DNA sequence: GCCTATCGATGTATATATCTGACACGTGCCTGGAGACTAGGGAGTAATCCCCTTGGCGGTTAAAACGCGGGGGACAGCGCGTACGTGCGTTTAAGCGGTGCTAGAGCTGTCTACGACCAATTGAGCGGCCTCGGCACCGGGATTCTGAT
DNA sequence: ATCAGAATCCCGGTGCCGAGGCCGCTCAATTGGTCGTAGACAGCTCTAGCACCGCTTAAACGCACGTACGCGCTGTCCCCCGCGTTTTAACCGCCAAGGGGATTACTCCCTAGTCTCCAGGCACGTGTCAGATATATACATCGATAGGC
């Protein structure tokens, strides 16, 4: 016993227990959020406190979520001895004596880079089960993480995801074979492509795919869970370009002038085009030297980018409407420019970014709760995962993405373990630019993938 | 009575273009002949290697041109290249 | 405060300890402080002479990648034959 | 407190690096220098990784040999400290310009 | 009718073409190669002879002699680069004394 | 025997050498004795180096020859060091050497 | 799939004569292969000039011998010339 | 018909003339025997090759061309003879 | 009793021999030396007259160049008198003294 | 004032153990080396010519060899103070594991413009011969540097 | 010191022989033609080169301190330079042998060329042990203390 939330969590624990009673690893792919941590804690107390197996447990998760995993365990299962292997080399060395030589823990909390660097210590333990959070990292069969983790002595493995498969069948068999390689090595040897006839079985033997996966993978859908039903309406805004960036966009398609050398938009390199075009439509001061004086402060910053012209207007509107917002960026320097605008406006903000430390991330999260911070500045990658951000009313994708599931993952920072209010999602598009092409290409990937991933248990 | 060809007459014709009043001594002609032969070997040697590295059977004006740019310094190369392309243009324009 | 960040000039990326570390392999015990700027000049002259020839081969072949053979041929032409990257 | 006297540690370093086979310049800084110099000769060039690596092997070998001759010039002048005039003398006698 | 005339050169294009064949430089020789090569040799010859003629005139001699060729070469950086390892018989040296050696 | 190398008693490939001489534009005609003589010389020099490198690896207590051992082998022999006087070997390093003036007293 | 060729197997068989029970790293093998190509071109190049200076059409073993005499250091040449002579006089007897 | 000793024919004042053309102001008395050593080593290496070309041609007479080819092979070069 | 002071006429010699073009070694002594060295490599050689001249021109040019680099090495040590240690340094840095 | 220890602090070499990727090795294939057989011209050979190298001689001079005085430079010793080696605490960015894109190196197939080869014809340039003036060399002037006062 | 006295330029004159032109001719460059292959172009595949984020951790950086090295100054003395005299042999002009290099006509053996054939060397896939990495030793050098002797 320890906590209660939602009725479907019981049948999840029963299915998990049944898979381990069948003595195999398994994948849990219930929708983004839905309390997979809660069901994992329930599994641990079932093992330790009904089956009475207390062999050591290993948990791997991203850096941005470690403190949340501590808290939820320390809330809901105080009876389990849980410790965290983190810190400097000298600190982690001391913890070898303090913990690994002393054997007083049920559970380790860890993160991937640490377990890759200190792997030889983790090999020494016969683990009861391995839990991998945000398992998409294991989609690639070249990865050293999948090699090392598949080599550990564990009784069973559990992989957690908010959405299995990001692109294609090779990701599926990679994830699937790394759970039970004796059953599925032929798949990663490549036979499964042939067996499912390169997805040219998508409707001709869909039932074959469903019957392959459903005994082995559980996945339940948020529209099926429904319950509170806050809406998630998305709108797309198309916008042009100001004259400065119009000149440079054409120049990038052609050649730069020596005026652009004094503005230093040449002496920068041209060996890739797509990156430079995206910068140009997003903001020309992403190029070095293009802002005419380094001491400049003023609303010209909002004029040099069409996106910023709309965003300034939209943020002023939303702020006047009292709505709080999350901004996701693909680029670090774009967050820097945006924060300069927040400083110029004097808006209340917080920031999470790959350079931000673990404590600072925890502090920032607690700071964005508890009080009306207007806006959160987030990297799409480091900020996209795990966290509760129900405090926001709205989400803006300032820049597009090559994979739609990255946006879905970011949007799911709301609604995990419920949300109180409807939320709007706003996408900004550079009209008649390469940004439209990337958007259309990305959408095409999703339109393929759903025919597989709406199968399985959901059928 | 035995025959031995040399560059001597062509060197003298060029001399009379740049300095009509000047003459040249026999020892100096021997040096000039040596110089022409030495430069010929250097350029032809590089042109040969360039064709070999590219698996090409034929030596062509391209090989001469890039051999020149590898061997000569600085502006001396720039003038030499300009003279070559000019001469070939005239020759192929004529027939 | 954050709009832009300075960058150091690329030749200064040949750091002071890196030069000392080379000189120690040459057996040099003690080093006067003027030598670091002197050495950077000498190195830059060397690279220019090799790269100019290497690019000349690449362009005659009408490629756009510079290739390890181009470097080997440039080094051989300048009398500094290198073993280990081709033949 | 404890200290080694001046030059005691320098002799250790000589013995270490003469025994080692490592490359001594950081790779990524050296790569930027090469890719910059090329822009004077052609506006846009890609590089094979092995091409950059060959340039570093040649460059470090050249500098090491130069420091040996530089050291002899300093000893000949009855100094122990090498100075820029020693590099200039070496390059002149080798006929490098 | 001669190819030299047709190209406007003084140097002998026909002779150059024969030498390119006989020297084993390659299997096959294109028609443009001898014309281009002859032009370069003519240029370099004119370049040296101009400077040598000036040196002889400075020396008030009407005929060029090997001394004048040496003075012509060693005072030009690009010719001295090209001929850096060549010795010229009866050339002598450039006059030069180190400043340290001069009297006070 | 079929192979010309085995008539000569050589290990190196006489036929491959003969082909390369023909293709290389070295001359108009190649006499039948020249490949045999050239192959023998290349084999001799190969054996000469490898023996010295083998000793260095054995002295260094390792069973595989590596580039360091080739550098040590070449630079310690007066004739090989003259033949390879202007060659640089990748991953070679240098010989240990310190001038006596620099040593402490 | 595009076929190359190299000296590697011949170098390997010579190694097993001078030292059995030893191996060679692939990096070292590349250096050995490069060395063989260098020496080949030095000898063949000088043999070409020797034929040209004497107005001969044909390369012969006598050109190869003189090229070796010029290129190799003073004693290393003497053994090489012996090995070359021994091989030819054996071959011609077959 | 046998030659000996005549390296000492490279006299002291003859060596001074060479040093003067080189711009040398003062000469220590040890330089002379050091110089004669260096000269003898140079000649031996050139003459070795010139004889080698002469034997290949089956000639008994050493020619100016043999010297010029020997010098060129050593990476020196001499304009104004042969060629 | 008139004497020039030391080093003055030494400079006049430099100015003279840098302006002249002549060969500076005595010819018959040099020829005997050439024939003596060849005597080791083959018996009863004969020489073309111009072959001996070519050897002398090359040899003299070599030594004159060597004395220049020797002079630099002496000045570097703040001396003005050349000494054998200077020659040994010059030939080492050139890479001749293998 | 050495010089002999003394401890002891530090850095390097040694030994035993575990784990991993690069190296030897076996396999199927194919393309390039071996085995005939032929044509013709590069080379070896004997004979001849006559150019050039070797060798010797006598006369005259320029140059080398030898002795001397003395002054300038090489050398060792000394005192000064600066700059560069060693060690510490703080800050930076090099390195690596990912993610994704598409430019461009590498290959195949076609076909036609080019260069090799040939015979007939012609004049460019070669060897031999002749002549005149650019230069060498000489006697003797004027000019300008040294160095002792 | 301004002056004497060596030693460098500058000049007009004499004459020698090499540079420059010319002639006759022969052999190699030109013209006009045929043949068949090298390489110029179009199309295609998919390797690998460029770009960015995220994160750890060793390297680089900035500073304080003290030493020993670089340097300027001085005094000693010996070894080189400048010069006059004596001795040597290099040079030059002439003669004269005959060894050897250079050319010729001739015959032959060796090499390139062609077609057929098959096994040596390559690209590939695999298993395991030589070396890399840990770490717990052992043990030599470097100093300060500071002995003594």
Numbering used by the authors:
A (entry chain K): 42 to 500
B (entry chain D): 28 to 122
C (entry chain B): 16 to 102
D (entry chain A): 38 to 134
E (entry chain C): 15 to 118
F (entry chain G): 14 to 118
G (entry chain H): 28 to 121
H (entry chain F): 20 to 102
Question: What does the original paper state about this entry?
Answer:
The chromatin remodeler ALC1 is activated by DNA damage-induced poly(ADP-ribose) deposited by PARP1/PARP2 and their co-factor HPF1. In the absence of PAR, the macro domain of ALC1 is placed against its ATPase, stabilizing an inactive conformation. Full activation of ALC1 requires the insertion of an Arginine anchor from the ALC1 linker into the acidic patch of the nucleosome. Remodelers such as ALC1 engage the nucleosome at SHL2, an internal DNA site located ~20 bp from the dyad, to move DNA around the histone octamer.
